[PDB]
């Protein structure tokens, strides 16, 4: 076979240990999921700089006045969270973030709301987005890409074991910490799903075909997205690449991918099995689950436990000039945070 006796036994034992870990992790998640609020207020923070922006608000570097600790504060304008799926998604995000615990998932510290906005205050990750490092260097070499990919595989194995789908994997959402490891943020599209779900949501280049085709879908969409991410990290551009969303969607549903001539055959094989339109064939979605990915030849050099334990030397370490340094982030237009004298949308956000 591919493995001899010692190797096959070590692998089996390793897989049983994973099951034991995930069972305990589910017990811990459920306690927090069943018992989530209002852990701070706006005037407790000095606002320093905008770190990123989206449709509903922005993420700001803030400094906690009492302790001096820096944090990333996501601010959502309650009014802009107007559409039905926007509201439900914001409640998912907060509830999931307060309940999960994993080395590659950003840690939420506080949550609160006022008349105008919702606030989630999380650990500041000063090394910047994978996105800007990738765009600056062009592409990552396969070992570098693999180091980040392994962290995503473990994070999805964790999330999916809790019946959580992530639904927005992309380099923009992956921050690099001071040891060169990844932190996933932006749980805006994450959801607890026991079987299928139906919302049309995500980022065009990363959408699985079944989302585009308005089919009820499952956690396999995250495995498709991993294929897109690995491709983009190793190529410098994603596999379905076009100027307008509708053209992107047409390429995704076609069932065709082309690879750069420098991709190894092992990498192409993995990607053809992740970027698989047929759900009966997509890696991550078969009887052996995540193990088809973790045991693939492209990951043969990966020590999964060492990655989890953060024992592996990272391919690069962002430069850090001190607490609150923002040099690894791009600049954005600053807008004053205005809080209305009248409560907005109080009934829609009661649970937050």
């Amino acid at each position: 076979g591919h493995m001899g006796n010692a190797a096959a036994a070590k692998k089996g034992s390793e897989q049983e240990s994973v099951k034991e870990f995930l069972a305990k992790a589910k017990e811990e998640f459920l306690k927090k999921w069943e018992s989530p609020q209002n852990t701070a207020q706006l005037d407790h923070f000095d606002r320093i700089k905008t770190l990123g922006t989206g449709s509903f608000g922005r993420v700001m570097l803030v400094k906690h006045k009492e302790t001096g600790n820096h944090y990333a504060m996501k601010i959502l304008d309650k009014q802009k969270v107007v559409k039905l799926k926007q509201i439900e998604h914001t409640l998912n995000e907060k509830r999931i973030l307060q309940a999960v615990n994993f080395p590659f998932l950003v840690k939420l510290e506080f949550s609160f709301k006022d008349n105008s906005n919702l606030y989630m205050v999380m650990e500041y990750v000063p090394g910047g987005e994978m996105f800007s490092h990738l765009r600056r260097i062009g592409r990552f070499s396969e070992p570098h890409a693999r180091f980040y990919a392994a962290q995503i595989v473990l994070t999805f194995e964790y999330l999916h074991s809790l019946d959580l789908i992530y639904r927005d994997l992309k380099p923009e959402n992956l921050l690099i910490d001071q040891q060169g490891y990844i932190q996933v943020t932006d749980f805006g599209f994450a959801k607890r799903v026991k079987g299928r779900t139906w919302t049309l949501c995500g980022t065009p280049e990363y959408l699985a075909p079944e989302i585009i085709l308005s089919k009820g879908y499952n956690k396999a969409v995250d495995w498709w997205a991993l294929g897109v991410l690995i491709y983009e990290m190793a190529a410098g551009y994603p596999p379905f690449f076009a100027d307008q969303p509708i053209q992107i969607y047409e390429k995704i549903v076609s069932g065709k991918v082309r690879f750069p001539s420098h991709f190894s055959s092992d990498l192409k094989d993995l990607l053809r099995n992740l970027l698989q339109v047929d759900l009966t064939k997509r890696f991550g979605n078969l009887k052996n689950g995540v193990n088809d990915i973790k045991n693939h030849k492209w990951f043969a050099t990966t020590d999964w436990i060492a990655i989890y334990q953060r024992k592996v030397e990272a391919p690069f370490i962002p430069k850090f000039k001190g607490p609150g340094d923002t040099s690894n982030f791009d600049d954005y237009e600053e807008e004053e945070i205005r809080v209305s004298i009248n409560e907005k949308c109080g009934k829609e956000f009661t649970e937050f």
Binding site: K85, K170, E205, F241
Partner: peptide, 13 residues
């Protein structure tokens, strides 16, 4: 040709 800048999510395509 395709999108090289930051990509926004869509909440309901």
């Amino acid at each position: 040709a395709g999108r090289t800048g930051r990509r926004q999510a869509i909440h309901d395509i």
